[PDB]
Amino acid sequence: VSVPALWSEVNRYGQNGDFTRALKTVNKILQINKDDVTALHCKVVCLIQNGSFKEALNVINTHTKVLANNSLSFEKAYCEYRLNRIENALKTIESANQQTDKLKELYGQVLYRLERYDECLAVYRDLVRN
Amino acid sequence: VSVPALWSEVNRYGQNGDFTRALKTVNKILQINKDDVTALHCKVVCLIQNGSFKEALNVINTHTKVLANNSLSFEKAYCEYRLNRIENALKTIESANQQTDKLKELYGQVLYRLERYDECLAVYRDLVRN
Numbered sequence A, B: 001v002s003v004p005a006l007w008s009e010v011n012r013y014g015q016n017g018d019f020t021r022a023l024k025t026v027n028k029i030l031q032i033n034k035d036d037v038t039a040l041h042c043k044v045v046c047l048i049q050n051g052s053f054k055e056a057l058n059v060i061n062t063h064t065k066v067l068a069n070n071s072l073s074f075e076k077a078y079c080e081y082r083l084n085r086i087e088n089a090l091k092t093i094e095s096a097n098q099q100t101d102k103l104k105e106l107y108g109q110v111l112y113r114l115e116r117y118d119e120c121l122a123v124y125r126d127l128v129r130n
Helices: A002-018 A021-031 A037-049 A053-061 A073-082 A086-097 A099-112 A117-128 B002-017 B020-030 B037-049 B054-062 B073-082 B084-093 B101-113 B117-129
Strands: none
Touching: A002 A021, A021 A037, A037 A053, A037 A073, A037 B002, A073 A086, A073 B117, A086 A099, A099 A117, A099 B117, A117 B002, A117 B101, A117 B117, B002 B037, B020 B037, B037 B054, B037 B073, B054 B101, B054 B117, B073 B084, B073 B101, B084 B101
16 A cells, blocks of 8 residues: 555566566556656656657656756667667767766767767777776 | 695785786796696786786797697787787687687777777677677
């Protein structure tokens, strides 16, 4: 009945691999708080894992003020990349809040797809020679 | 006097930090055993760590029978690379016993040095996807 009981079900289904029943749970947590910031993150992660890139992207687009403290540029870039919106995914990655090695690897891929192969080399070498 | 006391002293310096003293200890082990395959391997490693690339390369080039069935190609290429004998390092790598990741990363670096950028990029991408 309690919200922390549901988060335990999210992580059971998450570790299990069942991302559809994990999304079911995450929406119940969103029924409680329609702006639970951890819930909005885990919705996107599930939706991305289900191939639902256009709606996972939609969640992030209509929750900017709510997600200002933790902006999800990587999830957005990725969503845009998988939908073949490469120039979009480039804008997202270069604005991106904070750098990670997964954000860098995606920047590489975007530059590879844009035939910008010297910039891409630098990204991939940086990555390998930390 | 005893050999397992020396093999313990190598490990003390080697795993700690010092490789100058670790080198002399290994040459004590080589007075006794003429062609100790593990001591020859340790000489090469210690020599490389001291920047004595000509020497290490010569240890390999004149102990090819004794140090056979033994992955020395990376050590050999690395020495060639650090001596700015890039084409030699390239050949050493391209004929190498058993390819590995660090050997792959050196191959990339060797191609970058030859301005063979497109092949380089391929190597670094392959390395990041594994």
